[PDB]
Design a protein around this ligand. Structure first.
Ligand code: FES
Ligand code: FES
Ligand code: FES
Ligand code: FES
Ligand code: FES
Ligand code: FES
Ligand SMILES: [Fe+2]
Ligand SMILES: [Fe+2]
Ligand SMILES: [Fe+2]
Lengths: 105, 388, 388, 388, 110, 104
């Protein structure tokens, strides 16, 4: 049900970390201040990797065309994006970050 | 905005209208006649700057934006309808359903993550009175009646017409159609003599500004328009003079026509009665792009039975269409074209010098600015932009 | 202004000239020949970007702007001269007097408050030497002589010519005409051989800069221009060499011509004597719009009576027009067209690499920038703008 | 730059490429075949927006900008090569040497201080494999090998081809040629059937994205390119289904071709083997201007003697050219034309919705952005600008 | 009608406001209050059919609500394009705190 | 070899003086502050006289097209100028301005 991402200290606020899973598409973990969030890594507008994008607050900008998503809600923040990003439950326990196997129901 | 901000700032009374160069979004628009679209034979057209595809499946019409989501090519370049309910792009085979535009398959990669996640833009399509109407807007559409003039949809009202593309912005067409004094250009129309019509050269206004028209925004159907009442208090001109000398006479025919004129959003005129005392004319000026419009003409006449509908059709083909729609309205076509240069740079909206009868046009401009359902923009054409 | 300010800043020596893409306002310009405009037969033309209408009434010429004050259509789309001293717009019948452009009547509304309170723009028109000149300016016009080269108006000077529209900005035409070294393009003209002309290939300048030309700004009639004196101190080039070897020679004919060349505002060249020792050539490059001009060519030859006038006319039609105006100047036409691309983006005014003989052109550019009577702008065409 | 800055800011993965509307400067480009230019017969052409002149003197090719330094006219309007090693402008006779572009003489003024002090732009020209390559760049050129696909220059490789002007930006051409899934457009090609080729409708990607392509950042000669490896771990699709039903099948031929596909800067595709097992296709998409490109096609086959070359030449003319170069690639031509509108306003570079196989295109866009040798700008065309 | 038309009391008008004066058998007038001074012109814009009393007054310059053209209310001269025809000016006087406007326009200046 | 141009005081700061030379191209002497420089007078981009241009610091702007040169190096400072200007060594001794015979 959960995947070990990294130690909460390995991520500085405002940074992104890509999580490659076996047999499944990659995910992206963002650290907005002291809280962590996760979504699909692939931009819903194409085939770009959001982990290679730019994070401003709780908004992630795609490197391909400038589309953006709110990393908390996974909702489109900037055009041309229109399709909601899948959000995955994140959990910090004993100074370590974990991500849910499947996206939130 | 589609126009220089300096100009919009100057036309405080109808800026939204002046800015609506591409037309008003979120309104129904007639684009062709039902008999022009056959079962399983997709047809293309441009509406409000957008390339669209219309198809008939099991007798029902469907509309998809004619632009693949992938590399933006028009699907119509090489139409591939491989199953009854879908259309496949000729380039990389992305396949869409006509009913909801959903990307349901991709022949070049059946495992793509885009399948089932993307959706091509669809637009509501409705047939009425043998006319194909498309709702160029977003969300569930309002009743078609809201965007049609009174009586057009009457059960007994048999509708027949003609449609073509004219080289002028839609607004120049609308104003020419609702212009009370433009009647002067029709003074030598064959319809006048050949149908013994009474037709003045113009009107000497009478009464106050408010009495010149009847603005309608209390229509239970939601209709928004303006009635031209210049003839209620004005004295019609039948003897045109220069320096006191008569140089032209109006038509002293017996048939009284065009005494009930009204313009309705999104841009459709109702002339009643016309071209005959027992008929009515309904014509739309549909935006194709900023320089062109469909001049969708229809003539209506109550018909109690097939026998009457057939006799009506016969006289339509033999008289009305050639003598009226063409014989009378052809002069309006080049009249519209004649105004293109003055307004092409948007400066005409500031430099025009209006006179009394233009009060009807002013009323329309204000009504349209106040009650339109949206301003179509180039961004709507290429793809909405926002950093919100 | 009409040009990117960054470019104008760069050409400090003649910015006004570079900005005058549409030509200079407030000057007289020939636009047609008298015999081309007949009684009650309105003719249309575009001058300095403005659409104009000219008509002959009781023998006299009148000029009105071809644009109704109302909805800005060209009256000429459907001319309606209902009385001899007026013209009526085909649209809503606003009627104007040719004499002063006053809106004297409106057939569609005889009670309109606009009647007698609006005035359509008119421009002075004058016929001289069988040529029709229009003063495209405001206020009382100056004497015609001010905008004509010396001797064009002489009593006995019989003027004949030809006119056409050429696809190039007027300045390219002016510069090519006053270009001392462009003579090279005429080395194979049929006129050279067929009229035994002496024509060098170019000139090796002599003396200082000031001596290369004579700037005229003290003429009593007020005409402003420049004389090309390159031949006063320069050595004519008759043997063209490459690497010291003669590859081309000039013409060694007996008839000496074109040793008296001068360009005059607003843009007319005087070549004397040409194309024959007893004749003169006067040509205008009139601005129609930013991309085209009238190439108004005239040949003048003194005649003392009707007998010599007839003889000259016959020689003109059979020889001068085909051998000189066309046979010689046709090369000037495509030469002007060849410079269009380089100057079309206005960059050529910065990137051109001039040489000695261009001193004549620079003199002209300076004179034109200093003595022109006004810069025509796009606002003059649409309607002057000014905010409180 | 050449594109709206707001757009370039959005395409962070390949802004230089998107900005490279006019192509990449400082690369070699093929423009014609050697047999198309004969001794002393100058030929014109436009490359990267620049008008050029190519001449063959004593068997060797030379290239000069087709724009006189004086008034910017094209020398080619009227060619005047008065000595074997020079060209003289038809206007004022400024003469230039083909060898180095130096202004060696001026027939209209042999005493001009400009002589020997100005230089017309020249570009390196090289012939290889019967093809004429021009280095549209500044300074000493790199080896031609750097800008050619591997093996094109092999001693035994016999090259035969065809060239024409296509109406689409060069990039649209490049991406279509290197597009793994575009083969769907070739499903009905005569070549597939007439040459028993195996051709799937597309590929279901296999492995990771990194395995989809192979980038070559450097080579013996500094080549820069990308190999399409979608077929290494991907599953070829031979049955196209919609809603699970088979609506189309790929071609089950026995000849396996194009297993080796790569695109190289400045924009040349290598397909091996194609269109037959013992052959190779090398094709360039040369920028002429922002809206057009040369579609320079070539087919290569190793030949050990004149006998095989003769045979190959016969087969090329009777089969390969009409069945492959035209019968196969003609569909690529209209496909490129179909993408023009979407990218014409530069908005397609933002609104496109890519899918898996586009990894190949993305890899090329990044490679081109990172390794091109310069972005051609309109300033290069008119004249480089800069203020101190 | 008559020489002086009674408009209203000077107190019924705030500085910088405009009032339309309708007249039987004649075109309407517009009275402007610039500070404690009053001026008047035809109410109809000379450039069209707009009512200047429905426009915006800035100092002594009235801006037409139709196209942005404007006039100086004291001289009636155009102040902003596209207006080019001068307005007729009507003298205004205050008799016992009562505002009166002339029935006939002033005859051409200088 | 050197040519006596004039007294340093004959030129106000920021001004330019054209020096004619019989049988040779004219020269331009620029006074930048209290310093003096010399180059060919004719703009390398045409027939304009740089002495009739605008001096901004040690950069002379051509009056014709706005091209410019660094009067110290002769190198182009602004387009369309591309061909370097001929620079002539200059020395002022005892308030007297001297310019080298040939460019250097
Ligand atoms: S692929 Fe992310 S915005 Fe387009
Ligand atoms: S452009 Fe339509 S499937 Fe690629
Ligand atoms: S456009 Fe001329 S009278 Fe209306
Ligand atoms: S434009 Fe070529 S020599 Fe003058
Ligand atoms: S009606 Fe007043 S500015 Fe036009
Ligand atoms: S002549 Fe000096 S910048 Fe052109
Ligand atoms: Fe009409
Ligand atoms: Fe000439
Ligand atoms: Fe292809």
């Amino acid at each position: 049900i959960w995947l070990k991402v990294c130690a909460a200290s390995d991520m500085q606020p405002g940074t992104i970390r890509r999580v490659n899973r076996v047999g499944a598409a990659p995910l992206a973990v963002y650290r907005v201040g002291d809280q962590f969030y996760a979504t699909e890594d692939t931009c819903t507008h194409g085939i770009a990797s959001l982990s290679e994008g730019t994070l401003d607050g709780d908004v992630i900008e795609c490197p391909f065309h400038g589309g953006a998503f709110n990393v908390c809600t996974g909702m489109p923040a900037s055009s041309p994006c229109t399709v909601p990003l899948g959000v995955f439950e994140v959990e910090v326990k004993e100074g370590e970050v974990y991500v849910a196997g499947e996206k939130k129901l | 905005a589609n126009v220089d901000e300096a100009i919009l700032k100057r036309v405080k009374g109808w800026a939204p209208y002046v800015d609506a160069k591409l037309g008003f979004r979120n309104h129904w628009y007639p684009v062709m006649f039902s008999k022009e679209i056959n079962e399983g034979e997709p047809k293309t057209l441009k509406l409000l700057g957008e390339n669209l595809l219309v198809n008939r499946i099991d007798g029902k019409l469907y509309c998809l934006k004619d632009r693949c989501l992938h590399r933006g090519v028009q699907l119509s370049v090489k139409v591939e309808c491989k199953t009854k309910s879908t259309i496949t792009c000729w380039y990389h085979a992305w396949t869409y359903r006509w009913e909801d535009g959903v990307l349901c398959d991709i022949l070049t990669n059946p495992t793509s993550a885009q399948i089932g996640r993307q959706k091509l833009k669809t637009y509501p399509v409705q047939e009425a009175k043998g006319c194909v109407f498309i709702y160029l807007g977003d969300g569930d559409p309002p009743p078609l009646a809201r965007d049609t003039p009174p009586n057009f949809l009457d059960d007994d009202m048999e509708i027949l017409g003609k449609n073509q593309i004219i080289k002028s912005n839609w607004r120049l067409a609308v104003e020419n159609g609702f212009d009370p004094s433009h009647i002067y250009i029709h003074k030598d129309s064959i319809l006048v003599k050949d149908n013994d019509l009474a037709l003045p050269l113009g009107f000497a206004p009478g009464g106050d500004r408010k009495q010149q028209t009847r603005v309608v925004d209390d229509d239970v159907v939601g209709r928004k328009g303006v009635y031209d009442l210049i003839g209620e208090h004005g004295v019609p001109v039948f003897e045109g003079t220069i320096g006191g000398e008569v140089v032209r006479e109006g038509a002293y025919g017996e048939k009284i026509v065009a005494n009930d004129l009204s313009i309705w959003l999104p841009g459709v005129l109702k002339v009643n009665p016309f071209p005959n005392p027992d008929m009515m004319q309904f014509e739309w000026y549909v935006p194709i792009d900023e320089n062109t419009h469909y001049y969708f003409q229809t003539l209506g006449k109550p018909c109690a039975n097939d026998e009457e509908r057939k006799k009506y059709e016969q006289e339509f083909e033999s008289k009305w269409k050639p003598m009226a729609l063409e014989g009378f309205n052809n002069d309006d076509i080049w009249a519209r074209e004649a105004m293109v240069d003055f307004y092409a740079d948007d400066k005409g909206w500031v430099n025009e010098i209006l006179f009394e009868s233009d009060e009807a046009i002013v009323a329309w401009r204000k009504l349209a600015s106040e009650h339109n359902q949206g301003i179509q923009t180039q961004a709507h054409v290429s793809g909405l932009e926002h950093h919100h």
